[PDB]
Paper text:
[name] contains three conserved p97 interaction motifs: a [name]-interacting motif (VIM) helix and ubiquitin regulatory X (UBX) domain, which canonically interact with the NTD, and a PUB domain (peptide:N-glycanase and UBA-containing or UBX-containing proteins) that interacts with the C-terminal tail.
During 3D classification, additional structures with different [name] configurations were identified. Two additional states were identified, termed p97–UBXD1meta and p97–UBXD1para, in which densities for the VIM, PUB, lariat and UBX are also observed at other positions (across P2–P3 or P3–P4, respectively) in the p97 hexamer in conformations similar to p97–UBXD1closed, indicating that other configurations can occur. Additional [name] molecules may transiently bind p97; however, opening of the hexamer at one site would probably displace other molecules because of steric interactions and conformational changes across the ring.
Residue numbers in the entry:
A (entry chain F): 23 to 499, 509 to 707, 728 to 763
B (entry chain G): 354 to 441
C (entry chain A): 270 to 707, 728 to 763
């Protein structure tokens, strides 16, 4: 009773914890009341309690600084004991930790402690360690004397003192600059998957010593370099307390025969002695490359030694081996057999939201100017991974440092805290760094939630409902797991697949003709398995196969070479679909403009059982399309969108967009010429109408209608 | 009331204070200072279903109180303090 | 084991392998078990190293040395019979092999029963239900499920009674029973280690599970049972028994049940081969895997070897368009060759199925192959009623349910679609039953509600295509 399980913080502040309101009502404490937390080893900490809409009823959310003071870790239990008797302090003596005050001088109070405590009314206890960020440095302090005891609230009238040498960190104290869960930005789902698999056998090893069933022995993390594969492995070890052993390919391969294998097996023996432990093997493809691709004795023997060491984990209790590779198919397949490394996690490339969070993490210690907008930066940094965003922030800092240091003129071993405190990184420094930075993952496929929503698609009200029913029905109540779209081009086939992914907050994977053709041309259709594996790892996702007939057309379409409707790639797609369950949270959508020549296999029961016709928009839909296309621009009141829709009877949605963009282009011309007007006028649309034409003829519509009537 | 305005809380505190006329500020648990003349509801500023405020006298009167050597050793009126309850 | 021997230095791997054989002779009779044979002796033409070629030669001569090492039998285990150097499988050496594969539905139940011998199970525990849910699981996974279920029962009860110690009272142990919730929890924690590999088993489908098609049932018995039940009449009249039959027609009419039902009565293994397997072999230039399929049938005999989506090869060649040639190709050529070389004395019968019979390579229909053709149309009025009644045998049906009316309305529905109607109505009746305690039979309202979601899977134009083809064959 009156005790909750320790969970992760949402509010990063070091003086506050968050409870679920029902427990604050049972403890009869209010938002802002001061409480004591009772931790392990007869230690306690004082903090303020708030509440939110996300904390579990039976958990307390506290950050790393609070957990370290209590010597507790995620998953432990602490007692909450309100202490309204806490009084305001009169004098508190705070001294820095030496490990973080090196290379920096000046008045630490004026830069760090003063603004940290000023009007903050933070509870403080003797022996507390807390972190103050600023000046591109993370400086933590320890409280050594309080006039009231053993805790108090700092007030504007409280004397803050700081005199004496920095304190040497004790062996039982951990540094707050060590990587933890709060240093990981995107890929939260992947981290959650690791937690489920790894934290339990490390936090509660006594649950697995009593049974003959072993926990997962190895986890393979794969994705481009710089995405956090090592960061996750280290963060998990540091948060649970397991010993972290670092291994990498080059370190082992650089050794001579005999010494190489000895070092590899020695590391495993050390992990057992220090169990629970995690063994992280970086560049798995370098230490254990495919044996059939090399003739060296060192490479083949090391693979055999690693295989036996993985099997020995049934004896090395509480040792978990994690490995990082660029791709799961670049390593010797023996490692991926039942056991060993039979669990795989795709880290991928952070999306716009993840990139913003990563930038916010790297700027924890950075002073930003008022004009800095990290969301804008995250939107521009397409193709970047966390390693590149780290370099981006560092380069922006260095440019800001040069600009001000030319005025500071401080040449010494240490830099004053005051001159660093006044240093701020502005938008010109981030944009400069963006121009110099070059993404390391530009050619890799980027999978993210699309920004196209239902309000961006004109007409098709019934198709919107149908797609929502197909996704909602299997969750609210054999349901189909895919749909084919057919009809004239430029009517929204792709937009429909994106919009349903948008509303579901699902990842959208776009497969286009050129990609289907590349796989066929290069006889690399095996890559289809990787596409489906991406869809599974990206779940929830919508896997969109556009231009399904692109290969049939490349092979002649209406004439034909050695093939017809089926090809290397579509048959591999059929192979994977037949093995996918409705419970994988992957919705497969296809599109074709020539449904009469598409491999009929795809529409057979159990596959793309749904079939939706997308005709040309009607009159009211054409108006909706024009309004959607113009939603981002000023439009004059003289523009009659209904009149335009009445004329453009045979136009597709894509054709109406050309009209809008033509009118916009003219508005740009007039605006520039006049400046050397502020809205799009009817004259711009009337001129656009002189060039825009329907792309789909009446004969082509009959072709689509005949097919629709044939299948119903 | 959960929808009551911040001005009613300042009026409540003024009635409880020994000197109802002496300017002061109320600081909310989130670090945001509450303005007496602001038309903001308690359920909008994060003081619902329950919250603790930090009381401080205005800076102008604190300078006169300190300069005059007056110890501010009584905040509430004796009319309320004579009925003070202890917590257990 | 392969990887341990390979982890040694040159000269050490060969010495250690020789010692094991020398020790077996001294301790004869003895069995030498070599695990991961493909790792210790991979195909020489697939490796590069001198040490690996030397180890293969060392094992090959040690196997021959067994003519002098009295009473020593060497056994080996691999994942794939064709991942080892072919010399090992030559006369002598490893001249016998047995395909263990994956436990079947009955075997999975047997494994669960074996690993619960000592466990006290509660009345709500149903291991057959677990065995049916554990698709893709192997003995290693089913054993884990039993141990995990036992631990959950221990943690719920014993951790409130006993200390973290080595000894527990016998009375407390015997008082502990494992509930169905503990098995279901373990099922959610386990993940099948063999979900993609083909599983060959004697099917549980019987003739009572198939609605309609009374004449096809008899025809299959004449094709599959008569050649071995009455062989003296086939010899007397000089008849050559058919080696297989091809089914064609609309999907969802029972083609799979027909092949399983005859395998069931004959107590034969059912081997399911799907289109993607034949397609992969062609595109990957690995048509040698055709021999693996037919060899599985030879080793699994008696068995019924079922080739679904037989049209997949013709479609891969273009199907509706294609080039100016025929349907002959690498994979079908290997299939035809293996069929011609298969003897009827091995008790292997081949059944095919296609949804596009008009593009099947005519070679497969010649005498000695799938020469017999059976049309499986959509069920008729009397068959659709039979299908509905068969699916409802597991749940009482209210007197207000008119199954003949439904059959007369669902004219365009296949057997697969009629099953969804019955199963959906069953789920709806169950939902009401559970809610009534928060019913004894399926009411008309449950069938009428089910009809709101059920749809026909076969279009009118697809039906005419199949009927016109069947008419063309006269
Ligand atoms: N997902 C991520 N979230 C936060 N930081 C990340 C992420 N991925 C990479 N980083 C940052 O990039 C760097 C990763 O470098 P390193 O430690 O070599 O890991 P890896 O190369 O395996 O990604 C670190 O500075 C880390 O903070
Ligand atoms: N229903 C629609 N509503 C609004 N815009 C549309 C619609 N259909 C097509 N468009 C316009 O046509 C362009 C291309 O649409 P897209 O879905 O990519 O066509 P396709 O699916 O044939 O490639 C889009 O940028 C959009 O502006
Ligand atoms: N004649 C029938 N009698 C009973 N059930 C049937 C019949 N035909 C089909 N079904 C049901 O439809 C499902 C699919 O049958 P199957 O033969 O596998 O279709 P296909 O192989 O063409 O996809 C089966 O599980 C079965 O329950």
């Amino acid at each position: 009773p009156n005790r909750l399980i320790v969970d992760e913080a949402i509010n990063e502040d070091n003086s506050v914890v968050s409870l679920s309101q029902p427990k604050m009502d049972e403890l009869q404490l209010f938002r802002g009341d001061t409480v004591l937390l009772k931790g392990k080893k007869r230690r306690e900490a004082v903090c303020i309690v708030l509440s939110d809409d996300t904390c579990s009823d039976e958990k307390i959310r506290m950050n790393r600084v609070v957990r370290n003071n209590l010597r507790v870790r995620l998953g432990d239990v602490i007692s909450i004991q309100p202490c309204p008797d806490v009084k305001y302090g009169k004098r508190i003596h705070v001294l820095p930790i030496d490990d973080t005050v090196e290379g920096i001088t000046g008045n630490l109070f004026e830069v760090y402690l003063k603004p940290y405590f000023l009007e903050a009314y933070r509870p403080i206890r003797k022996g507390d360690i807390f972190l103050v960020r600023g000046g591109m440095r993370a400086v933590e302090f320890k409280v050594v004397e309080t006039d009231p005891s053993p805790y108090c609230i700092v007030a504007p009238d409280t004397v803050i003192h700081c005199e004496g040498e920095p304190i040497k960190r004790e062996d039982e104290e951990e540094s707050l600059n060590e990587v933890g869960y709060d240093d990981i930005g995107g890929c939260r789902k992947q981290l959650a998957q690791i937690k489920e698999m790894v934290e339990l056998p490390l936090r509660h090893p006594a649950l697995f010593k009593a049974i003959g069933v072993k926990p997962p022995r190895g986890i393979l993390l794969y994705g481009p370099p710089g995405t956090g594969k090592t960061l996750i492995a280290r963060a998990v070890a540091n948060e649970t307390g397991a010993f972290f052993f670092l291994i990498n390919g080059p370190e082992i391969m650089s050794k001579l025969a005999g010494e190489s294998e000895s070092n590899l097996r020695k590391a495993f023996e050390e992990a057992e002695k220090n169990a629970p432990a995690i063994i992280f093997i970086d560049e798995l493809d370098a230490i254990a490359p495919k044996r059939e691709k090399t003739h060296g004795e060192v490479e083949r023997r090391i693979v055999s030694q690693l295989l036996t060491l993985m099997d020995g984990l049934k004896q090395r209790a509480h040792v978990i081996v994690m490995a990082a590779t660029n791709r799961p198919n670049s390593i010797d397949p023996a490692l991926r057999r039942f056991g060993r490394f039979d669990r795989e996690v795709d880290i991928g490339i952070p999306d716009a939201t993840g990139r913003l969070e990563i930038l916010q993490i790297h700027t924890k210690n950075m002073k930003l100017a008022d004009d800095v907008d990290l969301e804008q930066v995250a939107n521009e940094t397409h193709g970047h991974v966390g390693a590149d965003l780290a370099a981006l922030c560092s380069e922006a800092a260095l440019q800001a440092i040069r600009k001000k240091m030319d005025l500071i003129d401080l040449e010494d071993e240490t830099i004053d805290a005051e001159v660093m405190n006044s240093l701020a990184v502005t938008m010109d420094d981030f944009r400069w760094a963006l121009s110099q930075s070059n993404p390391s993952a530009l050619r890799e496929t980027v999978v993210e939630v699309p920004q196209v929503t239902w309000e961006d698609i004109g007409g098709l009200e019934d198709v919107k409902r149908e797609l929502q029913e197909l996704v909602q029905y299997p969750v609210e109540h054999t349901p189909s797991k895919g749909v084919l779209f057919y009809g004239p081009p430029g009517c929204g086939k792709t937009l429909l697949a994106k919009a349903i992914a948008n509303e579901c907050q699902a990842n959208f994977i776009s497969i286009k003709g050129p990609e289907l053709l590349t796989m066929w041309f290069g006889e690399s259709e095996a890559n289809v398995r990787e596409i489906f594996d991406k869809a599974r790892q990206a779940a929830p996702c919508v896997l969109f196969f556009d231009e399904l007939d692109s290969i049939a057309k490349a092979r002649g379409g209406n004439i034909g070479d050695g093939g017809g409707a089926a090809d290397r790639v579509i048959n591999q797609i059929l192979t994977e679909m037949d093995g996918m369950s409705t419970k994988k949270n992957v919705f497969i959508i296809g599109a074709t403009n020539r449904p009469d020549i598409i491999d009929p296999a795809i529409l057979r029961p159990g596959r793309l059982d749904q079939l939706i016709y997308i005709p040309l928009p009607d009159e009211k839909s054409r108006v909706a399309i024009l309004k959607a296309n113009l939603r981002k621009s000023p439009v004059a009141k003289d523009v009659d969108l209904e009149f335009l829709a009445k004329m453009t009877n045979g136009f597709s949605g894509a054709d109406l967009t050309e009209i809008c963009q033509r009118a916009c282009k003219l508005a740009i011309r007039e605006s520039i010429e006049s400046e050397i007007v502020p809205e799009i006028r009817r004259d711009h649309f009337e001129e656009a109408m002189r060039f825009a034409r329907r792309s789909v003829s009446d004969n082509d519509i009959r072709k689509y209608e005949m097919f629709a009537q044939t299948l119903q | 009331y959960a929808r009551e305005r911040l001005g009613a809380v300042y009026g409540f505190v003024r009635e409880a204070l020994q000197s109802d006329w002496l300017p002061f500020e109320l600081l909310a648990s989130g670090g945001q200072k509450l303005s007496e003349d602001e038309n903001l509801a308690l359920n909008e500023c994060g003081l619902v279903p329950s919250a603790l405020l930090t009381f401080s006298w205005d800076m102008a009167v604190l300078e006169d109180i300190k300069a005059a050597g007056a110890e501010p050793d009584s905040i509430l009126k004796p009319e309320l303090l004579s009925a003070i309850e202890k917590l257990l | 084991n392969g990887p341990e021997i390979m982890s040694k230095l040159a000269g050490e791997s060969e010495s250690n392998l020789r010692k094991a054989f020398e020790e077996a002779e001294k301790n004869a009779p003895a069995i030498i078990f070599i695990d991961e044979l493909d790792a210790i002796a991979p195909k020489r033409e697939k490796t590069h190293g001198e040490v690996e070629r030397r180890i293969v030669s060392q094992l090959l001569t040690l196997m021959d040395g067994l003519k002098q090492r009295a009473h020593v039998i060497v056994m080996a285990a691999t994942n794939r019979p064709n991942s080892i150097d072919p010399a090992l499988r030559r006369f002598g050496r490893f001249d016998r092999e047995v395909d263990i594969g994956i436990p079947d539905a009955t075997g999975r139940l047997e494994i669960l029963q074996i690993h619960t011998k000592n466990m006290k199970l509660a009345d709500d525990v149903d291991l057959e239900q677990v065995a049916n849910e554990t698709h893709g699981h192997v003995g290693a996974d089913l054993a884990a499920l039993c141990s995990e279920a036992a631990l959950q029962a221990i943690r719920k009860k014993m951790d409130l009674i006993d200390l973290e110690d080595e000894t527990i009272d016998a009375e407390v142990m015997n008082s502990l029973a494992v509930t169905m919730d503990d098995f279901r929890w373990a099922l959610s924690q386990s993940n099948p280690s063999a979900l993609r590999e083909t599983v060959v088993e004697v099917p549980q489908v019987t003739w009572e599970d198939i609605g309609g098609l009374e004449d096809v049932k008899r025809e299959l018995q004449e094709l599959v049972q008569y050649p071995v039940e009455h062989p003296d009449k086939f010899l007397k009249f000089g008849m050559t028994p058919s080696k297989g039959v091809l089914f064609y027609g609309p999907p969802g009419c029972g083609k799979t049940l027909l092949a399983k039902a005859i395998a069931n009565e004959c107590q034969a293994n059912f081997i399911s081969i799907k289109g993607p397997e034949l397609l992969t072999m062609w595109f990957g230039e690995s048509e040698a895997n055709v021999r693996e399929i037919f060899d599985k049938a030879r080793q699994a005999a008696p068995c019924v070897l079922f080739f679904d989506e037989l049209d997949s090869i013709a479609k891969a060649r273009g199907g509706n368009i294609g080039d100016g040639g025929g349907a002959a190709d690498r994979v079908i050529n290997q299939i035809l060759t293996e069929m011609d070389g298969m003897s009827t004395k091995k008790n292997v019968f081949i059944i095919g199925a296609t949804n596009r019979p008009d593009i099947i390579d005519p070679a497969i229909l010649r005498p000695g192959r799938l020469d017999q053709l059976i049309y499986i149309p959509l069920p008729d009025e009397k068959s659709r009623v039979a299908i509905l009644k068969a699916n409802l045998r597991k749940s009482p049906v209210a007197k207000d349910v008119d199954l003949e009316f439904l059959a007369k309305m669902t004219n365009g529905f296949s057997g697969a679609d009629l099953t969804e109607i019955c199963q959906r109505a069953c789920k709806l009746a169950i939902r009401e039953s559970i809610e009534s305690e928060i019913v004894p039979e399926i009411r008309r309202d449950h069938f009428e509600e089910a009809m709101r979601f059920a749809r026909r899977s076969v279009s009118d134009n697809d039906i005419r295509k199949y009927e016109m083809f069947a008419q063309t064959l006269q």
